[PDB]
From a paper:
Here, we characterize the structure and function of a thermophilic dNDT, the protein from Chroococcidiopsis thermalis (CtNDT). Nucleoside 2′-deoxyribosyltransferase (dNDT) enzymes catalyze transglycosylation via a covalent 2′-deoxyribosylated enzyme intermediate with retention of configuration, having applications in the biocatalytic synthesis of 2′-deoxynucleoside analogues in a single step. The reaction catalyzed by dNDT proceeds via a ping-pong mechanism, with the formation of a 2′-deoxyribosyl-enzyme intermediate covalently linked to an active-site glutamate.13 Transglycosylation occurs in a stereospecific manner, preserving the anomeric carbon in the β configuration in the newly formed 2′-deoxyribonucleoside. As with other NDT enzymes, the active site of CtNDT is formed by residues from two monomers, and therefore, it is only fully formed in the dimer/tetramer.
Structures were obtained with the two potential transition-state analogues ImmH and DADmeH. Enzymes evolved to bind tightly to their cognate transition state and therefore to stable compounds that most closely mimic the charge distribution and geometry of that transition state. Based on Scheme 1 and considering 2′-deoxyribonucleside1 as a substrate, releasing nucleobase1 and generating a 2′-deoxyribosylated enzyme, ImmH would mimic an early transition state in which the distance between ribose C1′ and the nucleobase is ∼1.5 Å, while DADmeH would mimic a late transition state, since the presence of a methylene bridge between ribitol N1′ (which replaces C1′ in DADmeH) keeps the nucleobase at a distance of ∼3.0 Å from these groups. For ImmH, ΔH was −5.25 ± 0.07 kcal mol–1, −TΔS was −0.36 ± 0.14 kcal mol–1, and KD was 78.2 ± 6.6 μM, while for DADmeH, ΔH was −11.43 ± 0.29 kcal mol–1, −TΔS was 0.38 ± 0.73 kcal mol–1, and KD was 9 ± 5 nM. ΔG was −5.60 ± 0.08 for ImmH and −11.05 ± 0.42 kcal mol–1 for DADmeH; therefore, binding is determined by an enthalpic contribution. In the structure of bound DADmeH, however, E88 is 2.5 Å from N1′ in the sugar (analogous to C1′ in the substrate), 2.9 Å from Y7, and 3.5 Å from D62. D62 and Y7 are 3.4 Å apart. Stabilizing the nascent positive charge in the leaving group is D111, 2.5 Å away from Nitrogen 7 on DADmeH and 3.2 Å away from D62. The distance between D111 and N7 from DADmeH is shorter than the sum of the van der Waals radii for O and N, indicative of a very strong hydrogen bond between the two groups. Therefore, in the complex with DADmeH, E88 is closer to the bond that needs to be broken, D111 is closer to the nucleobase leaving group, and D62 is farther from interactions with the nucleobase when compared to an enzyme–substrate complex and also farther from the 3′-OH in comparison to the 2′-deoxyribosyl intermediate. This, coupled with the nM binding affinity of DADmeH for CtNDT, points toward a late transition state for the first half-reaction in which the bond order between sugar and nucleobase is negligible.
Residue numbers in the entry:
A (entry chain C), B (entry chain A), C (entry chain B): 2 to 155
D (entry chain D): 2 to 153
Write the structure that this text describes.
């Protein structure tokens, strides 16, 4: 069975970001052999004319985080997206694999060790957390970083 | 034994907000008979002179969310605080009781049903979610709202 | 005639913050002999039941920034409030006196020199901008900081 | 002389956004015959190892807003970017033309008339401000919207 990554991001909210930013990240993950669950694409069939669609998206996304093997969370922005953060907290509590992506060079932090709010790293090991922290789309395929180690059992 | 509420908020980051905003919320919860776990206060014996303090705070807060009975999440701001959101996601995944506080009247939402990102409500029931959503400090004591129903088994 | 300070803040958006955080700041400024224009208070005779109230607040605040002598901008939050930032940009372009207030210890910055986005400091001097930068309510009345020196022409 | 638009955005902060999002917007503006001043590109010839680079960037952007004819502010995100907002306030106070771009469908507002904080619209007319408000890159070239009309 392929490992399943839930690709959490705010990029579905902007028409241009949805069209241009997500496909390259999806493709980078798929090139490692990962099955990618991207929520904006997976919720295509919900009936958005009905008033309960927001509840139905919430529950579908909760189920996807429960059923994934890891989360790949796009945590660009100041601050990172609140929905992505909820999904990240779910992933941490459910002991999913955690991978963080930030190619935004601004620092937005409450501490000196981590580049973001310390809670985002609570599900990563004390040592080597930066191996799970990706700062460019080109880095996703790196054999030295945590996605590759995960797939190769190292 | 008293129910334990984890009071998640960004109010510890600002000197004035920590001093003035949190004690009234703490007192409102305590007046219901709740034991309040406030993380900015509870992390007062971490050695902040040591470089790992941020990791030890992260783990301490994760353990507190695992051990609470419910979270009372202050979700003021545009957007809500990313650390609060991680803790909220943890609470949802761990089937804790979920209560939300927002006396910020700005609307910051991706949908028409809820006043915030739909993910924040994923741990609340489809019907009656607003019973868990508090919009003033004065409302916390309300016998018609979910904190009181929780405590009285209704 | 008293110097006029426009007190820009997001604190009017939260019921508790409006009641508890703003009066102490207003009072500290007034103790210096300043006439304080606080926008949430100053627009309390607008009819908020009428559809044009938002345009009338915008124009009232535009006029107040044009007519003030200085702006005292509360730039707490990650990021600072977007309305406060528009008013700050107006003040810079109109050669008003500029004073910044941040008692939030988090860093949210795109550079190493300043704790915030470099644009917020465009109306401050290259050297000694920190004299215009207030990090606690108790510091506002300091005779060593720029607000007091400005009022006394020293 | 070609009208000058200052293209304010936070897209320069993210490597992928700077590479992918900004060139299409620049090209849409330039297709209208506009001279586009994009701050992340224009700041290139600043020495970023001299300690004062942040101050120099700030002053250079201030001057570009003073010397543009209009601002085209990308106000995506929740909230819109604080540096874009400072530049927008400068443009309002300096009586520059104002155009806003938001293809982010989330609402982030303190009022019922506008989809964002009311201050962002203080430099736009009470009626017809929507004609200055662009919600897709495709819309930038519309002859029914305010940017094209401003060119005549
Ligand atoms: O409109 C939507 N479509 C699909 N999913 C979401 C969500 C849920 N998550 C949260 C996060 C964006 O907040 C992204 O991973 C999708 C919120 N709004 C929508
Ligand atoms: O500096 C800190 N002190 C204590 N806790 C936190 C946390 C953890 N949570 C997250 C949330 C603020 O982000 C609040 O509930 C405390 C992040 N930074 C700090
Ligand atoms: O409800 C309101 N009342 C008064 N002013 C504003 C503004 C304008 N400014 C902007 C800034 C808050 O965004 C504060 O200085 C007031 C936005 N909303 C309101
Ligand atoms: O690193 C930077 N490069 C170029 N410009 C800016 C600015 C000035 N403005 C502000 C706004 C981004 O905050 C965008 O229009 C550029 C701040 N930081 C930088």
């Amino acid at each position: 069975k392929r490992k399943i990554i839930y690709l959490a991001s705010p990029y579905g909210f902007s028409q241009q970001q949805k069209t241009l930013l997500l496909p390259p990240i999806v493709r980078a993950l798929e090139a490692l052999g990962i099955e990618v669950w991207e929520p904006f694409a997976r919720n295509n069939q919900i009936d958005f004319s009905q008033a309960d669609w927001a509840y139905r998206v919430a529950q579908a996304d909760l189920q996807d985080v429960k059923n994934c093997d890891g989360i790949f969370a796009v945590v660009n922005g100041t601050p990172p997206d609140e929905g992505v953060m909820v999904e990240l907290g779910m992933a941490i509590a459910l002991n999913k694999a955690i991978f963080l992506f930030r190619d935004d060079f601004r620092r937005c932090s409450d501490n000196e060790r981590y580049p973001l709010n310390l809670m985002l790293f609570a599900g990563l090991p004390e040592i080597g957390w930066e191996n799970y922290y990706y700062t460019s789309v080109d880095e996703i395929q790196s054999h030295d970083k945590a996605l590759y180690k995960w797939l190769t059992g190292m």
